[PDB]
Amino acid sequence: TTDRSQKLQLRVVPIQTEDNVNYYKARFTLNVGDNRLVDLGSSYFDIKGT
Amino acid sequence: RNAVPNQVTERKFLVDRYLWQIPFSSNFLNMGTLTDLGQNVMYANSSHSLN
Structure with a gap:
């Protein structure tokens, strides 16, 4: 585990949303900087x- | 059909038989009994007050 100031x-x-009678769009921008990893198993919506 | 409008919600929780815990580790998970921040926060045999 490093010493640098990064977030757990x-x-x-979302960047863009969209409404409808029958759906809802959410478009995100997942930025993973240099010297970072992320597993998408921990990804969820709120x-x-x- | 005769439900009242303007219903405000509220939430809570209950934990029983449980101490809350905060580990003294780097990534907050058990990699060992002698934890990894127990060798480099206390560094060069120094002292740190706490409150």
């Missing part, structure tokens, strides 16, 4: 709605 979790908000 991550939070990315829906808030009513």
